[PDB]
Amino acid sequence: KVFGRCELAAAMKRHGLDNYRGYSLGNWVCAAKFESNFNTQATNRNTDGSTDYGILQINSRWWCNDGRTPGSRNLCNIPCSALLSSDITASVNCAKKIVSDGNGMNAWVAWRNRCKGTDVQAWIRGCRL
Numbered sequence: 001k002v003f004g005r006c007e008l009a010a011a012m013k014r015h016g017l018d019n020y021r022g023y024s025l026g027n028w029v030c031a032a033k034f035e036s037n038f039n040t041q042a043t044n045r046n047t048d049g050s051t052d053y054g055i056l057q058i059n060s061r062w063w064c065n066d067g068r069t070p071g072s073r074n075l076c077n078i079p080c081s082a083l084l085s086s087d088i089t090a091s092v093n094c095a096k097k098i099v100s101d102g103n104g105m106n107a108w109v110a111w112r113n114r115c116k117g118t119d120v121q122a123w124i125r126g127c128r129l
C-alpha cells in the first residue's frame with residue numbers, strides 16, 4: 001500500500017509515534033517519505049547482504065528475520081515480511097524499539113540526511129489529526 005502523507009500521519013499518531021522518545025510526528029512522516037516513498041512494500045538490499053523492509057526500511061541485520069541474513073539478529077521478533085503489510089502496526093512497534101536503543105532516529109540514514117534539522121512540521125501541515 002502507498003500511503004498518502006496525511007493518511008500515514010494519522011496512522012502513525014494513532015499508533016503512538018507522535019513525540020515518541022521526543023520525536024514529533026513530522027519526523028516520522030519525513031523519514032517514511034525518504035526511506036520508502038510511503039510504500040509499505042519497499043525493499044532494498046544492502047551491500048552486506050541484509051535487506052531493508054517496509055515503510056521505515058527496517059534492516060534484517062538486526063531487527064527482523066528474512067531467512068537469508070546469516071548471523072543476523074531478530075530483535076523485533078518478527079519475520080521481515082510482516083513489515084511489508086498495509087497494516088503498519090508491526091513496523092511502528094519495531095521502530096519504537098529501534099528509536100529507543102540509544103541512537104534515536106539517527107538509525108534511519110534518510111532521516112539524518114534529509115529530515116534532521118529541517119522544518120519537519122511541514123510534513124503534517126494541512127492534515128486533520
Ligand SMILES: [Cl-]
Nearest residue numbers: 024025026121
Ligand atoms: Cl512535527
Ligand SMILES: [Cl-]
Nearest residue numbers: 109110113114
Ligand atoms: Cl540519505
